[PDB]
Amino acid sequence: KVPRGSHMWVFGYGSLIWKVDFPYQDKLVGYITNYSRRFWQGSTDHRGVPGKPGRVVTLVEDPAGCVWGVAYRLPVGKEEEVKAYLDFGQKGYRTTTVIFYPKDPTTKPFSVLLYIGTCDNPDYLGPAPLEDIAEQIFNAAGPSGRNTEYLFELANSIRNLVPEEADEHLFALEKLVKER
């Protein structure tokens, strides 16, 4: 099309795939490499509560990893302001820039903003057997709804975008909770 004077894309890997409250003027299905998506982050403000946390996704460095999701272009001339809105909502998350590979075989890979949760983050739980993650999810609910709803919306979304092979961790957990 016609060149724009500015560009900023943010990569969505969690709830951003099905729910965005910020404005965007394009979105593309694709993946990033060198990270894996893990249910190793506590939720005490959305999908659980203090004393009974939920498990939501967090990205971990994984050289052989990939994360399928959605990149969202921030509105041209409004990228910095919209970034700020994201940056001051991040209970914190660090930012980096990674190559995003569009699912489409017509659009070239490009640099996207990536929000990464820290080990320094107080809600971080860390790894746990998948049986124990699914139990937690089944039982957890927060101010934004059941932890189960989160997992099923993420699983349904990624399934609508790519085969299930695209994320074994997610689909083990999903089909896992489904057992209840």
From Swiss-Prot:
Native species of this protein?
Homo sapiens
Residues annotated as the enzyme's active site: Q90 (proton acceptor)
Q: What is this protein called?
A: Glutathione-specific gamma-glutamylcyclotransferase 2
What EC number(s) does its UniProt record assign?
4.3.2.7
Assembly, per entry: Monomer.
Q: Which domain of life is it from?
A: Eukaryota
The UniProt entry's GO CC annotations, sorted and at most eight, read: cytoplasm; cytosol
Function comment: Catalyzes the cleavage of glutathione into 5-oxo-L-proline and a Cys-Gly dipeptide. Acts specifically on glutathione, but not on other gamma-glutamyl peptides.
**Keyword Lyase assigned:** yes
Q: What Pfam family is a match for this entry? A: ChaC
Q: Which residues bind substrate?
A: V10, F11, G12, Y13, G14, S15
